[PDB]
Write a protein that binds this ligand. Structure first.
Ligand code: FMN
Ligand code: FMN
Lengths: 184, 185
């Protein structure tokens, strides 16, 4: 039931270096809302989901379902509902792949952490997306997509290469001194 | 306001390879509840937090605060409250560093995603932890730690090297076919 645990320990210098570079890698990440229609490899899609599946989960429930949508039609019907639920865009059609993460009713925290791992894994693999969380369209998408009662939509990520013409907003990230407080 | 966006595109082969290896790296991760007292570099601690700070955030609120506790005393007082809130362990003392992530009142999803990035970054840097989320001790820790009204505790992660004697439970992860469903037709 409890086995010894096998670690890979790096010399402090390399721990600094590995952590620096990883930071450098992720900081290049930006939500991209202009996504090419260009095929992306299914092996990479699978790999990032495998990555996301390595998340910790409250009580080890591993309560996540990763729904991969590729059918152009399905993607459009998804687009329609989302847009409909206001009620007071294009990437959902142009992206090659939709990944919707449903949680299986702490679960929400696990799943979202899993989404975090998913995001890192795309960045690390040369793909972009724009995280979104249309919880108001959740129900109708549960039904459209055939998901069972016990799944509720959490995150919807359109995945692909950026458009040759893509742009992002000129936004700056908080510096470290603005997000980290040390107790002495 | 809107600048062109600069991408690094890898040839498909390398995208496969990079994504495989990253998967291999993260899959080595396991919550470890036996943590050595051995100093860990502050530069690595800072780096993983910087990484966690790169998360996406609803409306770009970036609403996370990363409280680093190192004082042995402070860590103990934190331990006491947590244990007290049942009311029907040791790693919080033995770990060199506590990282508590508070959210600043979608925020909860952003922050948790950020925690995900934090977890990857520790794994990637040779450190372990055991994710936990003592929301019942949140209030008393807000006060103990001096955090302001608008912060609520979310995640508490004790960080360190595993114990020379550490063990984990023999748990298997769902295979891909168990967490991934493809829509065709
Ligand atoms: C939201 C959340 C809360 C958790 N709370 C605790 C906890 O209170 N105590 C604990 O030992 N582990 C806690 N964990 C860790 C899980 O028990 C651990 O991730 C699970 O056993 C899966 O094991 P693994 O992380 O090695 O894959 C929590 C994990 C998550 C995602
Ligand atoms: C929980 C969550 C929900 C989000 N929802 C949307 C959304 O509905 N539309 C959108 O364009 N971006 C959405 N985003 C992306 C954020 O707007 C984006 O991350 C933020 O502008 C920061 O920019 P960056 O990711 O490039 O750092 C969401 C992000 C998070 C974390």
């Amino acid at each position: 039931e409890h086995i010894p645990f096998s670690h890979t320990r790096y010399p402090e210098q390399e721990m600094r270096m590995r952590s620096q570079e990883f930071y450098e890698l992720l900081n290049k990440r930006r939500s991209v809302r202009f996504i090419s229609s260009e095929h992306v490899p299914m092996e990479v899609i699978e790999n990032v989901i495998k990555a996301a599946g390595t998340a910790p989960s409250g009580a080890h429930t591993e309560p996540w379902t990763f729904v991969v949508v590729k059918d152009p039609d399905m993607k459009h019907k998804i687009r329609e509902i989302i847009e409909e639920e206001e009620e007071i865009k294009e990437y959902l059609d142009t992206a090659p792949v939709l990944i919707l993460i449903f949680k299986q009713v702490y679960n929400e925290i696990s799943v979202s952490i899993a989404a975090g791992l998913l995001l890192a894994a795309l960045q690390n693999a040369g793909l972009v997306t724009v995280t979104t969380t249309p919880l108001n369209a959740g129900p109708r998408l549960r039904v459209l997509l055939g998901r069972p009662s016990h799944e509720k939509l959490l995150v919807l990520l359109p995945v692909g290469y950026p458009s040759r013409d893509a742009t992002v907003p000129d936004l700056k990230r908080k510096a470290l001194d603005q997000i980290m407080v040390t107790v002495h």
